[PDB]
Short mmCIF file of N, CA and C in Angstrom, two decimals:
data_model
loop_
_atom_site.label_atom_id
_atom_site.label_comp_id
_atom_site.label_asym_id
_atom_site.label_seq_id
_atom_site.Cartn_x
_atom_site.Cartn_y
_atom_site.Cartn_z
N UNK A 1 -69.17 2.41 32.23
CA UNK A 1 -70.01 2.75 31.05
C UNK A 1 -69.45 2.17 29.77
N UNK A 2 -69.71 0.89 29.54
CA UNK A 2 -69.22 0.21 28.35
C UNK A 2 -70.36 0.04 27.34
N UNK A 3 -70.22 0.64 26.15
CA UNK A 3 -71.21 0.53 25.09
C UNK A 3 -70.95 -0.66 24.17
N UNK A 4 -71.96 -1.49 23.97
CA UNK A 4 -71.82 -2.64 23.11
C UNK A 4 -73.09 -2.92 22.33
N UNK A 5 -73.89 -1.88 22.13
CA UNK A 5 -75.14 -2.00 21.39
C UNK A 5 -74.88 -2.22 19.90
N UNK A 6 -73.77 -1.69 19.42
CA UNK A 6 -73.40 -1.83 18.02
C UNK A 6 -71.90 -2.07 17.88
N UNK A 7 -71.53 -2.83 16.87
CA UNK A 7 -70.13 -3.10 16.61
C UNK A 7 -69.95 -4.18 15.57
N UNK A 8 -70.26 -5.41 15.94
CA UNK A 8 -70.11 -6.52 15.04
C UNK A 8 -69.18 -7.58 15.60
N UNK A 9 -68.55 -8.33 14.71
CA UNK A 9 -67.62 -9.36 15.14
C UNK A 9 -66.22 -8.82 15.35
N UNK A 10 -66.09 -7.87 16.26
CA UNK A 10 -64.80 -7.30 16.56
C UNK A 10 -64.84 -5.79 16.67
N UNK A 11 -63.74 -5.15 16.30
CA UNK A 11 -63.64 -3.71 16.42
C UNK A 11 -63.08 -3.30 17.76
N UNK A 12 -63.15 -2.02 18.08
CA UNK A 12 -62.72 -1.54 19.37
C UNK A 12 -63.92 -1.45 20.31
N UNK A 13 -63.81 -2.09 21.47
CA UNK A 13 -64.92 -2.14 22.41
C UNK A 13 -64.49 -2.44 23.84
N UNK A 14 -64.59 -1.43 24.69
CA UNK A 14 -64.48 -1.61 26.13
C UNK A 14 -64.74 -0.30 26.86
N UNK A 15 -64.04 0.74 26.41
CA UNK A 15 -64.08 2.05 27.07
C UNK A 15 -63.67 1.89 28.53
N UNK A 16 -62.50 1.29 28.69
CA UNK A 16 -61.98 0.88 29.98
C UNK A 16 -61.44 2.08 30.77
N UNK A 17 -60.84 1.78 31.91
CA UNK A 17 -60.19 2.78 32.75
C UNK A 17 -59.18 3.60 31.97
N UNK A 18 -58.60 3.03 30.91
CA UNK A 18 -57.69 3.78 30.06
C UNK A 18 -58.37 5.05 29.53
N UNK A 19 -59.67 4.97 29.33
CA UNK A 19 -60.48 6.11 28.89
C UNK A 19 -60.75 7.04 30.03
N UNK A 20 -60.87 6.54 31.22
CA UNK A 20 -61.08 7.43 32.32
C UNK A 20 -59.81 8.13 32.76
N UNK A 21 -58.66 7.56 32.48
CA UNK A 21 -57.41 8.26 32.72
C UNK A 21 -57.25 9.36 31.66
N UNK A 22 -57.82 9.08 30.49
CA UNK A 22 -57.85 10.02 29.36
C UNK A 22 -58.95 11.05 29.56
N UNK A 23 -60.01 10.73 30.26
CA UNK A 23 -60.96 11.77 30.64
C UNK A 23 -60.22 12.84 31.44
N UNK A 24 -59.45 12.40 32.43
CA UNK A 24 -58.66 13.31 33.23
C UNK A 24 -57.57 14.03 32.43
N UNK A 25 -56.76 13.27 31.69
CA UNK A 25 -55.63 13.83 30.96
C UNK A 25 -56.06 14.85 29.89
N UNK A 26 -57.04 14.49 29.06
CA UNK A 26 -57.45 15.33 27.93
C UNK A 26 -58.16 16.59 28.40
N UNK A 27 -58.97 16.44 29.44
CA UNK A 27 -59.69 17.58 29.99
C UNK A 27 -58.71 18.66 30.45
N UNK A 28 -57.58 18.24 31.00
CA UNK A 28 -56.55 19.19 31.42
C UNK A 28 -55.99 19.95 30.23
N UNK A 29 -55.75 19.23 29.13
CA UNK A 29 -55.17 19.80 27.91
C UNK A 29 -55.85 21.10 27.51
N UNK A 30 -57.09 21.00 27.06
CA UNK A 30 -57.84 22.15 26.56
C UNK A 30 -58.26 23.10 27.68
N UNK A 31 -58.67 22.57 28.81
CA UNK A 31 -59.23 23.42 29.85
C UNK A 31 -58.15 24.25 30.53
N UNK A 32 -57.09 23.60 30.99
CA UNK A 32 -56.03 24.32 31.66
C UNK A 32 -55.29 25.20 30.66
N UNK A 33 -55.36 24.80 29.38
CA UNK A 33 -54.68 25.54 28.33
C UNK A 33 -55.09 27.00 28.36
N UNK A 34 -56.39 27.24 28.63
CA UNK A 34 -56.94 28.58 28.68
C UNK A 34 -56.97 29.13 30.11
N UNK A 35 -56.68 28.29 31.09
CA UNK A 35 -56.59 28.75 32.49
C UNK A 35 -55.23 29.38 32.73
N UNK A 36 -54.30 29.18 31.82
CA UNK A 36 -53.04 29.92 31.86
C UNK A 36 -53.22 31.33 31.30
N UNK A 37 -54.43 31.64 30.83
CA UNK A 37 -54.72 32.97 30.30
C UNK A 37 -54.89 34.00 31.43
N UNK A 38 -55.78 33.74 32.43
CA UNK A 38 -55.90 34.62 33.60
C UNK A 38 -54.60 34.67 34.41
N UNK A 39 -54.04 33.50 34.67
CA UNK A 39 -52.76 33.40 35.36
C UNK A 39 -51.70 32.93 34.38
N UNK A 40 -50.90 33.87 33.84
CA UNK A 40 -49.94 33.57 32.77
C UNK A 40 -49.04 32.36 33.06
N UNK A 41 -48.21 32.37 34.12
CA UNK A 41 -47.38 31.23 34.43
C UNK A 41 -48.09 30.24 35.32
N UNK A 42 -48.57 29.20 34.69
CA UNK A 42 -49.05 28.04 35.39
C UNK A 42 -47.87 27.34 36.05
N UNK A 43 -46.66 27.75 35.62
CA UNK A 43 -45.43 27.01 35.90
C UNK A 43 -45.40 25.75 35.06
N UNK A 44 -46.55 25.48 34.42
CA UNK A 44 -46.79 24.35 33.52
C UNK A 44 -46.42 22.97 34.10
N UNK A 45 -45.25 22.85 34.71
CA UNK A 45 -44.86 21.64 35.42
C UNK A 45 -45.94 21.18 36.42
N UNK A 46 -46.55 22.10 37.19
CA UNK A 46 -47.70 21.77 38.04
C UNK A 46 -48.80 20.99 37.28
N UNK A 47 -49.09 21.43 36.06
CA UNK A 47 -50.04 20.74 35.19
C UNK A 47 -49.42 19.49 34.59
N UNK A 48 -48.11 19.53 34.37
CA UNK A 48 -47.34 18.32 34.05
C UNK A 48 -47.62 17.25 35.11
N UNK A 49 -47.79 17.69 36.35
CA UNK A 49 -48.21 16.81 37.43
C UNK A 49 -49.64 16.32 37.20
N UNK A 50 -50.49 17.18 36.66
CA UNK A 50 -51.92 16.87 36.51
C UNK A 50 -52.16 15.92 35.33
N UNK A 51 -51.55 16.23 34.20
CA UNK A 51 -51.73 15.43 32.99
C UNK A 51 -50.75 14.27 33.00
N UNK A 52 -49.56 14.48 33.55
CA UNK A 52 -48.60 13.41 33.67
C UNK A 52 -49.16 12.28 34.51
N UNK A 53 -49.81 12.65 35.61
CA UNK A 53 -50.47 11.69 36.48
C UNK A 53 -51.60 10.98 35.75
N UNK A 54 -52.31 11.71 34.89
CA UNK A 54 -53.48 11.17 34.23
C UNK A 54 -53.09 10.22 33.11
N UNK A 55 -52.03 10.56 32.41
CA UNK A 55 -51.54 9.77 31.28
C UNK A 55 -50.59 8.68 31.76
N UNK A 56 -50.00 8.82 32.95
CA UNK A 56 -49.34 7.67 33.56
C UNK A 56 -50.37 6.71 34.16
N UNK A 57 -51.46 7.25 34.72
CA UNK A 57 -52.55 6.40 35.19
C UNK A 57 -53.09 5.65 33.99
N UNK A 58 -53.10 6.34 32.86
CA UNK A 58 -53.45 5.74 31.59
C UNK A 58 -52.48 4.63 31.25
N UNK A 59 -51.20 4.93 31.38
CA UNK A 59 -50.15 4.02 30.97
C UNK A 59 -50.19 2.78 31.85
N UNK A 60 -50.47 3.00 33.13
CA UNK A 60 -50.58 1.92 34.10
C UNK A 60 -51.84 1.09 33.90
N UNK A 61 -52.91 1.69 33.42
CA UNK A 61 -54.09 0.89 33.08
C UNK A 61 -53.80 0.07 31.82
N UNK A 62 -53.05 0.66 30.89
CA UNK A 62 -52.56 -0.07 29.72
C UNK A 62 -51.51 -1.11 30.13
N UNK A 63 -50.65 -0.75 31.07
CA UNK A 63 -49.60 -1.67 31.51
C UNK A 63 -50.25 -2.84 32.23
N UNK A 64 -51.26 -2.51 33.01
CA UNK A 64 -52.02 -3.50 33.74
C UNK A 64 -52.82 -4.36 32.75
N UNK A 65 -53.19 -3.75 31.63
CA UNK A 65 -53.88 -4.45 30.55
C UNK A 65 -52.94 -5.45 29.87
N UNK A 66 -51.64 -5.27 30.06
CA UNK A 66 -50.67 -6.13 29.42
C UNK A 66 -50.75 -7.55 30.00
N UNK A 67 -50.66 -7.73 31.34
CA UNK A 67 -50.73 -9.07 31.93
C UNK A 67 -52.15 -9.53 32.31
N UNK A 68 -53.17 -8.72 32.07
CA UNK A 68 -54.53 -9.20 32.28
C UNK A 68 -55.05 -9.95 31.05
N UNK A 69 -54.52 -9.63 29.88
CA UNK A 69 -54.94 -10.32 28.67
C UNK A 69 -53.83 -11.25 28.15
N UNK A 70 -54.20 -12.24 27.31
CA UNK A 70 -53.25 -13.22 26.74
C UNK A 70 -52.05 -12.58 26.04
N UNK A 71 -51.05 -13.41 25.76
CA UNK A 71 -49.74 -12.97 25.28
C UNK A 71 -49.81 -12.06 24.05
N UNK A 72 -50.80 -12.29 23.20
CA UNK A 72 -50.95 -11.50 21.98
C UNK A 72 -51.15 -10.01 22.29
N UNK A 73 -52.12 -9.70 23.14
CA UNK A 73 -52.47 -8.32 23.46
C UNK A 73 -51.28 -7.56 24.08
N UNK A 74 -50.33 -8.30 24.63
CA UNK A 74 -49.16 -7.71 25.30
C UNK A 74 -48.47 -6.67 24.43
N UNK A 75 -48.36 -6.95 23.14
CA UNK A 75 -47.56 -6.11 22.26
C UNK A 75 -48.32 -4.89 21.77
N UNK A 76 -49.65 -4.90 21.84
CA UNK A 76 -50.40 -3.69 21.55
C UNK A 76 -50.25 -2.73 22.72
N UNK A 77 -50.17 -3.29 23.92
CA UNK A 77 -49.94 -2.49 25.11
C UNK A 77 -48.51 -1.99 25.10
N UNK A 78 -47.63 -2.79 24.53
CA UNK A 78 -46.25 -2.38 24.34
C UNK A 78 -46.20 -1.11 23.52
N UNK A 79 -46.84 -1.16 22.36
CA UNK A 79 -46.75 -0.08 21.39
C UNK A 79 -47.45 1.17 21.90
N UNK A 80 -48.65 0.98 22.43
CA UNK A 80 -49.51 2.08 22.80
C UNK A 80 -48.98 2.88 23.98
N UNK A 81 -48.66 2.20 25.08
CA UNK A 81 -48.20 2.91 26.27
C UNK A 81 -46.86 3.62 26.02
N UNK A 82 -46.07 3.09 25.09
CA UNK A 82 -44.82 3.72 24.69
C UNK A 82 -45.05 4.93 23.81
N UNK A 83 -45.98 4.80 22.88
CA UNK A 83 -46.27 5.89 21.97
C UNK A 83 -46.60 7.20 22.70
N UNK A 84 -47.62 7.21 23.56
CA UNK A 84 -47.97 8.44 24.28
C UNK A 84 -46.88 8.78 25.28
N UNK A 85 -46.14 7.76 25.66
CA UNK A 85 -44.98 7.90 26.52
C UNK A 85 -44.03 8.96 25.98
N UNK A 86 -43.63 8.82 24.73
CA UNK A 86 -42.75 9.80 24.10
C UNK A 86 -43.53 11.06 23.71
N UNK A 87 -44.83 10.92 23.47
CA UNK A 87 -45.66 12.09 23.15
C UNK A 87 -45.71 13.05 24.34
N UNK A 88 -46.06 12.51 25.50
CA UNK A 88 -45.93 13.20 26.79
C UNK A 88 -44.52 13.75 26.97
N UNK A 89 -43.53 13.13 26.38
CA UNK A 89 -42.19 13.69 26.48
C UNK A 89 -42.07 15.00 25.67
N UNK A 90 -42.73 15.11 24.52
CA UNK A 90 -42.68 16.38 23.80
C UNK A 90 -43.63 17.40 24.43
N UNK A 91 -44.71 16.93 25.04
CA UNK A 91 -45.64 17.84 25.70
C UNK A 91 -44.91 18.68 26.72
N UNK A 92 -44.10 18.01 27.52
CA UNK A 92 -43.42 18.64 28.63
C UNK A 92 -42.32 19.59 28.15
N UNK A 93 -41.67 19.26 27.03
CA UNK A 93 -40.60 20.10 26.49
C UNK A 93 -41.12 21.47 26.04
N UNK A 94 -42.27 21.48 25.40
CA UNK A 94 -42.87 22.72 24.89
C UNK A 94 -43.52 23.45 26.05
N UNK A 95 -44.06 22.66 26.95
CA UNK A 95 -44.66 23.15 28.17
C UNK A 95 -43.60 23.85 29.01
N UNK A 96 -42.37 23.39 28.80
CA UNK A 96 -41.27 23.73 29.66
C UNK A 96 -40.81 25.16 29.40
N UNK A 97 -40.54 25.46 28.14
CA UNK A 97 -40.07 26.79 27.76
C UNK A 97 -41.19 27.81 27.77
N UNK A 98 -42.43 27.36 27.86
CA UNK A 98 -43.52 28.31 27.93
C UNK A 98 -43.50 29.02 29.28
N UNK A 99 -43.41 28.28 30.37
CA UNK A 99 -43.27 28.90 31.69
C UNK A 99 -41.89 29.51 31.89
N UNK A 100 -40.85 28.96 31.27
CA UNK A 100 -39.52 29.52 31.45
C UNK A 100 -39.51 30.99 31.01
N UNK A 101 -40.07 31.25 29.84
CA UNK A 101 -40.25 32.61 29.38
C UNK A 101 -41.73 32.90 29.28
N UNK A 102 -42.47 32.43 30.29
CA UNK A 102 -43.89 32.74 30.43
C UNK A 102 -44.09 34.24 30.41
N UNK A 103 -43.03 34.92 30.78
CA UNK A 103 -42.98 36.37 30.73
C UNK A 103 -43.27 36.89 29.31
N UNK A 104 -43.11 36.03 28.29
CA UNK A 104 -43.20 36.49 26.90
C UNK A 104 -43.87 35.50 25.92
N UNK A 105 -43.46 35.64 24.66
CA UNK A 105 -44.02 34.93 23.54
C UNK A 105 -44.00 33.42 23.73
N UNK A 106 -42.94 32.87 24.34
CA UNK A 106 -42.90 31.44 24.58
C UNK A 106 -44.13 30.99 25.30
N UNK A 107 -44.58 31.78 26.26
CA UNK A 107 -45.68 31.35 27.08
C UNK A 107 -46.84 30.96 26.20
N UNK A 108 -47.21 31.90 25.33
CA UNK A 108 -48.37 31.69 24.46
C UNK A 108 -48.07 30.67 23.34
N UNK A 109 -46.89 30.75 22.76
CA UNK A 109 -46.47 29.87 21.67
C UNK A 109 -46.23 28.44 22.15
N UNK A 110 -45.37 28.30 23.13
CA UNK A 110 -44.97 27.01 23.68
C UNK A 110 -46.11 26.23 24.30
N UNK A 111 -47.06 26.98 24.89
CA UNK A 111 -48.22 26.41 25.58
C UNK A 111 -49.26 25.98 24.56
N UNK A 112 -49.26 26.65 23.42
CA UNK A 112 -50.09 26.22 22.31
C UNK A 112 -49.51 24.95 21.73
N UNK A 113 -48.21 24.98 21.44
CA UNK A 113 -47.45 23.76 21.17
C UNK A 113 -47.64 22.74 22.30
N UNK A 114 -47.84 23.22 23.52
CA UNK A 114 -48.07 22.33 24.64
C UNK A 114 -49.40 21.64 24.49
N UNK A 115 -50.47 22.38 24.20
CA UNK A 115 -51.76 21.74 24.11
C UNK A 115 -51.92 21.10 22.73
N UNK A 116 -50.97 21.39 21.84
CA UNK A 116 -50.89 20.71 20.55
C UNK A 116 -50.29 19.32 20.75
N UNK A 117 -49.22 19.23 21.52
CA UNK A 117 -48.65 17.95 21.89
C UNK A 117 -49.52 17.29 22.94
N UNK A 118 -50.30 18.09 23.63
CA UNK A 118 -51.30 17.57 24.55
C UNK A 118 -52.58 17.22 23.79
N UNK A 119 -52.84 17.86 22.66
CA UNK A 119 -53.89 17.39 21.77
C UNK A 119 -53.37 16.20 20.96
N UNK A 120 -52.06 16.09 20.84
CA UNK A 120 -51.39 14.86 20.44
C UNK A 120 -51.49 13.84 21.55
N UNK A 121 -51.29 14.27 22.78
CA UNK A 121 -51.60 13.44 23.92
C UNK A 121 -53.06 13.00 23.84
N UNK A 122 -53.96 13.95 23.63
CA UNK A 122 -55.37 13.65 23.44
C UNK A 122 -55.61 12.74 22.24
N UNK A 123 -54.93 13.02 21.13
CA UNK A 123 -55.14 12.26 19.90
C UNK A 123 -54.66 10.84 20.06
N UNK A 124 -53.43 10.69 20.54
CA UNK A 124 -52.86 9.37 20.71
C UNK A 124 -53.41 8.66 21.94
N UNK A 125 -53.82 9.40 22.96
CA UNK A 125 -54.51 8.77 24.09
C UNK A 125 -55.87 8.25 23.63
N UNK A 126 -56.44 8.88 22.62
CA UNK A 126 -57.59 8.31 21.94
C UNK A 126 -57.14 7.08 21.15
N UNK A 127 -56.10 7.29 20.34
CA UNK A 127 -55.59 6.27 19.42
C UNK A 127 -55.05 5.04 20.14
N UNK A 128 -54.09 5.25 21.03
CA UNK A 128 -53.49 4.16 21.79
C UNK A 128 -54.54 3.44 22.61
N UNK A 129 -55.52 4.17 23.15
CA UNK A 129 -56.55 3.50 23.93
C UNK A 129 -57.38 2.62 22.99
N UNK A 130 -57.76 3.24 21.87
CA UNK A 130 -58.42 2.57 20.74
C UNK A 130 -57.63 1.34 20.32
N UNK A 131 -56.33 1.41 20.56
CA UNK A 131 -55.40 0.32 20.27
C UNK A 131 -55.52 -0.82 21.28
N UNK A 132 -55.89 -0.52 22.52
CA UNK A 132 -56.19 -1.58 23.49
C UNK A 132 -57.64 -2.04 23.39
N UNK A 133 -58.53 -1.13 23.08
CA UNK A 133 -59.87 -1.53 22.69
C UNK A 133 -59.77 -2.41 21.44
N UNK A 134 -58.91 -2.00 20.51
CA UNK A 134 -58.51 -2.84 19.38
C UNK A 134 -57.88 -4.12 19.89
N UNK A 135 -56.87 -3.97 20.74
CA UNK A 135 -56.02 -5.06 21.18
C UNK A 135 -56.82 -6.20 21.73
N UNK A 136 -57.76 -5.89 22.58
CA UNK A 136 -58.47 -6.93 23.27
C UNK A 136 -59.33 -7.74 22.30
N UNK A 137 -60.08 -7.06 21.44
CA UNK A 137 -60.95 -7.77 20.50
C UNK A 137 -60.18 -8.30 19.29
N UNK A 138 -59.16 -7.57 18.87
CA UNK A 138 -58.34 -7.96 17.71
C UNK A 138 -57.52 -9.21 18.01
N UNK A 139 -57.08 -9.36 19.25
CA UNK A 139 -56.36 -10.56 19.65
C UNK A 139 -57.32 -11.75 19.78
N UNK A 140 -58.58 -11.46 20.11
CA UNK A 140 -59.62 -12.48 20.12
C UNK A 140 -60.05 -12.82 18.69
N UNK A 141 -60.02 -11.82 17.82
CA UNK A 141 -60.37 -12.00 16.42
C UNK A 141 -59.23 -12.64 15.65
N UNK A 142 -58.07 -12.71 16.28
CA UNK A 142 -56.88 -13.24 15.64
C UNK A 142 -56.85 -14.75 15.76
N UNK A 143 -56.22 -15.40 14.80
CA UNK A 143 -56.18 -16.84 14.77
C UNK A 143 -54.78 -17.35 15.09
N UNK A 144 -53.77 -16.65 14.59
CA UNK A 144 -52.40 -17.11 14.71
C UNK A 144 -51.85 -16.88 16.13
N UNK A 145 -51.61 -15.62 16.57
CA UNK A 145 -51.13 -15.37 17.91
C UNK A 145 -52.26 -14.98 18.87
N UNK A 146 -52.31 -15.66 20.01
CA UNK A 146 -53.31 -15.38 21.02
C UNK A 146 -52.73 -15.61 22.41
#
């Protein structure tokens, strides 16, 4: 499902598999966030498996985007897949102490921080993806490095 009815001479345009890995990853963020409500300890790491897999699938679609496009686009994939890379690293840290003391305040606090860093995951998975949607057309729109 690639939309190209409007845009112009460039911009972000593809809505590639990176978005479908983000369909999976982001949906987990908000949805599972409240599924820890009925069942307090998700163990969170289990969902780390769910979103980690989705955002690594994302990273691999971005990584795969690195050698599918010319040398220029390589460095947008460099920046983007690394960015959420460390973002996912904070997601898991807050996610971590939430289940550790899921018995208490951490659970609710840390998991909110979890879906906050996962809404950061969502935000930057939007952004970084937008960066490859950017990357592909911006490197074509570029004159110097291609």
